């Protein structure tokens, strides 16, 4: 069943997952060409009110995601019973269990987990994460940290790919990651699951940069801009044509205040 | 034993939510939502005014608890006099004795005490606590993180003890600064010898159900109260039923 | 109860002097000088002594024979119990075998002696099964300063405990990191729940009498390291029996030789 | 799997006493006393410590001789990480290879890849994570080592209790918390769960370090080991002593027998 | 190019074993055992050896003769070049003559060997002119642990470099503090741009084969410190040639004597 959830995620490759806090936006997001939406709504931040999640799951035809506090396996049980497509055990919400993540294998629905390095990614996957998002800074409009983490993961992967097999045991120890998944990763030459970028992706250029670095897609938290619909479509187009500078100029052209 | 009796009293609260109330109005609502009991409370925070506690007791038929300051054995004498059902020697109000807790064996009224780990719990029980609340944040942070930490620490240590080489249990008791005979008992029962409720930061039905799935016996709770309270009671009662948990959480209003 | 019985066995040693011995000869010299019991033992790792030499000692004297086992070495203990030793000394003067745990002494029929430096430690040893406590100072120095420290420490806390407010005993138990049951039991009796001897540095009659005057039920001696062992041994034995009799203490300390 | 087979091959050692030897005579005295196997090396750990220099694999010659003097399995030590010393031992036709940390470490960062060999490996460990890492590298047998060449058993006791302690903790652990436990151990999650289910090390586990007397050996068995290493010849009378230790391991739960075999054994190290 | 030629000269040493020698006798014993080349040398300050003994060695054997110069001592080098040595070893096993600078090796017609502990250091030596790299562990201990560390270090980084994103190589060059040209040139070749031997601790046939199996083009040995040098020398030579043949490795390591 795990290899099935992984497959369900590979569908999203080349896509843009957009945050949304109501129906209108969810539609304004699907109408821009998002491959899926992420439902949400100082102060503790928790799972979103099911009602609003149902209002979004019935307002669009693309997959609907939702956040569950790290370690809060009951918030997840509730999201699953709601009938959404993906659960994101996200560190942008208020951490619920500082020592353990959700045992995601105990769920039917696919899980997204954040990470900052290769060991962190491999641990989330072993816990049953079907998809991994490499997170930078959340809600700053600055992509510097995302770039760091993306290069970090892809960097070690390239190191692992060509590494002497004898030395891999020690490498797994240093990463604090499961040996099996490490050797797997070494064989595949990439993450054994879909890998998106998230954090500080504000402009089309940012989105394309992540793709050029080698990501399968991006999250966006677009709505913090002067014109959502236009910005959303541009970012979507940027991810789809992330190699076409001539195209990237058009979609970045007069997109208003970011 | 008189202690066995007190431990037997608290056991009737199993499966329930205990709601903190500050007037007869709040107490009545809490009862209607199915709270198993209410805990009365009114800068230095002290035992509540006996008048308030009397009014609450008269207004409801569920057991009534009230707080005493840590180490304030007189406040506890007062509460026991006006006939409350339980006294919570509560670190949420201002500690009165930094070094010693109440000698709870001197009372007829059963006591609840807070704890953050297994050693603490057992020390409180040896002093005569009939019930334990595994506590997270002291303020109203609405964050369940510390509570989960301390529930896992308690539950986890109990599991370690359960399987431990008998010869090693002496040192284990020393390490957690707990009375050996109680450590031994906990080992035999594969459980802490008294009712154990989670407390601190419980804000949603999901929070409350999480505590129950982590193995607790019940929970304490601190823009539509009647609904929210009912939701949490239902959550605790049907903590393994995701479909019910879903219904309970739907449009509950702002937490 | 089995434990109570073991405790009772150790009470027949009160007012006595226990002497270390390494051969049958010394054991007799020890019994001849009036030792209550003998302790069988032989840098370098120090372990339980050969059962061969233990058997020879238990067959030379008619007084109780004790033997050492390394701390935590429960199999050494088993071996000592199986050869009919009267007491087992889980002693720190041997090479520690286990750093974090002591022998679970309840699992034995033979009474145990354990060492200690303070009340909490004594009570922990007792809770593990120890039937007799040895308050140990310095080993192999002939300087009793550490024994005095520990005896005063244990007896000091016992007196503090006696008169303490009952509502404060819980916290006290925690500070000692000792079992509450035994703490209260110590409070009641107003003394240690088991026999208490002093050990470490006792080199003269005066040393031994000092221990008794402080409150010890008896002393260990580690004698033949003196000039005239037979003489020094008897003097110490008499010192323990007449510990509050200066005239006598002078009479047995006179011309004792090189101590 | 070929690893399942190597693991099996080691099962025959359960209840055994492996002895270090520096020549034929000794190897013969070791089998004559009932040793389940001998470990050939040109210097006992006590001498390695007291002497110094660099301790390497022993000369094949002295290994071939020993392997022709006895009928019980013959082991040999290969410096940690020295996979060529291993290859040479494998080629020589020994039963087991001990990638031993009593010899002079050859690679500070990487152990020998033991899977690349058809001959079973024994690796030393000091805790559970260290054991599970050695096993993942191919080790078919584990020996929890205390201190070497001191005759003091204290560190062996610490390590045995360490490994067995965590194994018991692991068995009763909440399934959702095992992932974190694996991280903290720095050990492969697969082997951790396999250890949880099984309730013990998924391979044979011997004690080693400072085992001097029969009581020491029996202690290790009562703590839950499968047998012991002895590094016997540094004592008064090797034969009597070696026999006594063997008997102690076979009769570890029998104090009367333990007293018997310990009586007049001579001077220990 | 002159440098390329020097590099070519060092390639005729691949798969070989270089042996330290202090007299003509040893040099022959070394050539007799099949050494590819010999290294001439004789506390206390260690300097270049007397040209007298160097000339005697270059006149005893028909294989290439190498000699040491102190690090930074360019005049010693000049003297070695003027006496027709085949290779100069600017070696750290001699007493450093200059702490901050190495010899500018380009200014010579004779190829140089330099030591290193990591990739950056190897590349810096090469940029200075070095035509052959010696990855050095510990000198005069017989313990190969440090050589293994360095070989793995150099080869480890080379593999990291091979697959690295090109836009990250600049920063990598900085971190190594090595010349970017050579870093890219190393990336391309997928190996060191010059011959690489291992040195330090190699005391047995197994040691030598291990170095070759790790990736070394050959080894240095510092032999006569053994029981039977002639025998040990040949074994090591065979070890290097048949480094992936266990059967052979067993055959040459058998009854080698005191190592």
From Swiss-Prot, chain B:
InterPro entries: Aldolase_TIM, PdxS/SNZ, PdxS/SNZ_N, RibuloseP-bd_barrel. GO terms for biological process: pyridoxal phosphate biosynthetic process. GO terms for molecular function: protein heterodimerization activity. It is found in: Cytoplasm. The protein has no function in the formation of pyridoxal 5'-phosphate. Gene3D superfamilies: Aldolase class I. Keywords: Acetylation, Cytoplasm, Pyridoxal phosphate. Its main location: cytoplasm. The keyword Acetylation applies. GO terms for cellular component: cytosol. This is Pyridoxal 5'-phosphate synthase-like subunit PDX1.2. Homodimer or heterodimer with PDX1.1 or PDX1.3. No interaction with PDX2. Belongs to the PdxS/SNZ family. Disulfide bonds: none annotated. Coiled coil: none annotated. Unlike PDX1.1 or PDX1.3, PDX1.2 is unable to interact with PDX2 and restore prototrophy in yeast snz1 mutants. Expressed in callus tissues, flowers and roots. Weakly expressed in leaves and stems. SUPFAM superfamilies: Ribulose-phoshate binding barrel. The keyword Cytoplasm applies. It holds the Pfam family SOR_SNZ.
UniProtKB/Swiss-Prot annotation, chains C, E:
D-glyceraldehyde 3-phosphate binds at residue 152. GO terms for cellular component: cytosol; endomembrane system; plasma membrane. Disruption phenotype: Plants have a lower leaf carotenoid and chlorophyll a and b content, and are impaired both in root cell division and in root cell elongation. Mutant rsr4-1 can be complemented by the addition of any of the vitamin B6 vitamers, except pyridoxal 5'-phosphate. Vitamin B6 is an essential quencher of singlet oxygen in plants, that can protect cellular membranes from lipid peroxidation. Pathway: Cofactor biosynthesis; pyridoxal 5'-phosphate biosynthesis. Transmembrane segments: none annotated. Expressed in cotyledons, rapidly dividing root stele tissues, stems, leaves, flowers, mature pollen, and siliques. Belongs to the PdxS/SNZ family. It holds the Pfam family SOR_SNZ. Keywords: Acetylation, Cell membrane, Cytoplasm, Lyase, Membrane, Pyridoxal phosphate, Schiff base. It is found in: Cytoplasm; Cell membrane; Membrane. GO terms for molecular function: protein heterodimerization activity; protein homodimerization activity; pyridoxal 5'-phosphate synthase (glutamine hydrolysing) activity. It comes from Arabidopsis thaliana (Mouse-ear cress). Catalyzes the formation of pyridoxal 5'-phosphate from ribose 5-phosphate (RBP), glyceraldehyde 3-phosphate (G3P) and ammonia. The ammonia is provided by PDX2. Can also use ribulose 5-phosphate and dihydroxyacetone phosphate as substrates, resulting from enzyme-catalyzed isomerization of RBP and G3P, respectively. Also plays an indirect role in resistance to singlet oxygen-generating photosensitizers. This is Pyridoxal 5'-phosphate synthase subunit PDX1.3. D-ribose 5-phosphate binds at residues 20, 140, 201. Its main location: cytoplasm. The lineage of its organism: Eukaryota, Viridiplantae, Streptophyta, Embryophyta, Tracheophyta. It is an enzyme of class 4 (lyase). Homodimer or heterodimer with PDX1.1 or PDX1.2. Interacts with PDX2. The keyword Membrane applies. Its EC number is 4.3.3.6. Induction: Not induced by cold, salt, drought or UV stress, or by abscisic acid or jasmonic acid.
Swiss-Prot record, chain D:
One of its GO terms (molecular function) is protein heterodimerization activity. The active site is at 77 (schiff-base intermediate with d-ribose 5-phosphate). It is an enzyme of class 4 (lyase). It holds the Pfam family SOR_SNZ. Expressed in cotyledons, rapidly dividing root stele tissues, stems, leaves, flowers, mature pollen, and siliques. Its EC number is 4.3.3.6. Pathway: Cofactor biosynthesis; pyridoxal 5'-phosphate biosynthesis. GO terms for biological process: amino acid metabolic process; chlorophyll metabolic process; hyperosmotic salinity response; pyridoxal phosphate biosynthetic process; response to lipid hydroperoxide; response to non-ionic osmotic stress; response to oxidative stress; response to salt stress. Disruption phenotype: Plants have a lower leaf carotenoid and chlorophyll a and b content, and are impaired both in root cell division and in root cell elongation. Mutant rsr4-1 can be complemented by the addition of any of the vitamin B6 vitamers, except pyridoxal 5'-phosphate. InterPro entries: Aldolase_TIM (IPR013785), PdxS/SNZ (IPR001852), PdxS/SNZ_N (IPR033755), RibuloseP-bd_barrel (IPR011060). D-glyceraldehyde 3-phosphate binds at residue 161. Induction: Not induced by cold, salt, drought or UV stress, or by abscisic acid or jasmonic acid. Keywords: Acetylation, Cell membrane, Cytoplasm, Lyase, Membrane, Pyridoxal phosphate, Schiff base. GO terms for cellular component: cytosol; endomembrane system; plasma membrane. D-ribose 5-phosphate binds at residues 20, 149, 210. The keyword Phosphoprotein does not apply. It is found in: Cytoplasm; Cell membrane; Membrane. It catalyses: aldehydo-D-ribose 5-phosphate + D-glyceraldehyde 3-phosphate + L-glutamine = pyridoxal 5'-phosphate + L-glutamate + phosphate + 3 H2O + H(+). Vitamin B6 is an essential quencher of singlet oxygen in plants, that can protect cellular membranes from lipid peroxidation. Homodimer or heterodimer with PDX1.1 or PDX1.2. Interacts with PDX2. Belongs to the PdxS/SNZ family. This is Pyridoxal 5'-phosphate synthase subunit PDX1.3.
């Amino acid at each position: 069943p795990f290899s099935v959830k992984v497959g369900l995620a590979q569908m999203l490759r080349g896509g843009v997952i957009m945050d949304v806090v109501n129906a209108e936006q969810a539609r304004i997001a699907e109408e821009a060409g998002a491959c899926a939406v992420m439902a949400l709504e100082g102060g503790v931040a928790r799972m979103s009110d099911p009602q609003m999640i149902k209002e979004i799951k019935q307002a669009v035809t693309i997959p609907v995601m939702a956040k569950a506090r790290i370690g809060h396996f009951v918030e997840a049980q509730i999201l699953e019973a709601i009938g959404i497509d993906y659960i994101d055990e996200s560190e942008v919400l208020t951490l619920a269990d500082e020592d353990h993540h959700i045992n995601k294998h105990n769920f039917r629905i696919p899980f997204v987990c954040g990470c900052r390095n290769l060991g962190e990614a491999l641990r989330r996957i072993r816990e049953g994460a079907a998809m991994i998002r490499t997170k930078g800074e959340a809600g700053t409009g600055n992509i510097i940290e995302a770039v760091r983490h993306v290069r970090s993961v892809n960097g070690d992967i390239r190191v692992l790919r060509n590494m002497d097999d004898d030395e891999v045991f020690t490498f797994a120890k240093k990463l604090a990651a499961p040996y099996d998944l490490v050797m797997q990763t070494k064989q595949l030459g990439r993450l054994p699951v879909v890998q998106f970028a998230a954090g500080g992706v504000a402009t089309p250029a940012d989105a394309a940069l992540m793709m050029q670095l080698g990501c399968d897609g991006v999250f966006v938290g677009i709505f913090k801009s002067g014109d959502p619909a236009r910005r959303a479509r541009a970012i979507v187009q940027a991810v789809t044509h992330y190699s076409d500078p001539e195209m990237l100029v058009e979609v970045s052209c007069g997109l208003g205040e970011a | 034993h008189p202690f066995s009796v007190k431990v037997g009293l608290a056991q009737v609260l199993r499966g329930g939510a205990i709601v903190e109330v500050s007037s007869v109005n709040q107490a009545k609502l809490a009862e209607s939502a199915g709270a198993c009991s209410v805990i009365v409370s009114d800068g230095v925070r002290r035992m509540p005014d006996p008048v308030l506690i009397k009014e609450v007791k008269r207004a409801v038929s569920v057991p009534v608890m009230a707080r005493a300051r840590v180490g304030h054995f007189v406040e506890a004498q007062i509460l026991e006099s006006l006939a409350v059902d339980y006294i919570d020697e509560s670190e949420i109000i201002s500690v009165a004795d930094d070094d010693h807790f109440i000698n709870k064996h001197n009372f007829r009224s059963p006591f609840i005490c807070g704890c953050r780990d297994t050693g603490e719990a057992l020390r409180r029980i040896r002093e005569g606590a009939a019930m334990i609340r595994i506590q997270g944040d002291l303020t109203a942070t609405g964050n369940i993180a510390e509570t989960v930490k301390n529930v896992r620490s308690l539950m986890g240590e109990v599991r370690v003890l359960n399987n431990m080489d008998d010869d090693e249990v002496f040192t284990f008791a020393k390490k957690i600064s707990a009375p050996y005979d109680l450590v031994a008992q906990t080992k035999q029962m594969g459980r802490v010898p008294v009712v154990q409720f989670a407390s601190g930061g419980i804000t949603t039905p999901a929070d409350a159900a999480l505590m129950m799935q982590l193995g607790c016996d019940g929970v304490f709770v601190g823009p539509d109260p009647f609904k929210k309270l009912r939701s949490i009671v239902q959550a605790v009662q049907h903590y393994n039923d995701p479909h019910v948990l879903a219904e309970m959480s739907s449009g509950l209003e702002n937490a």
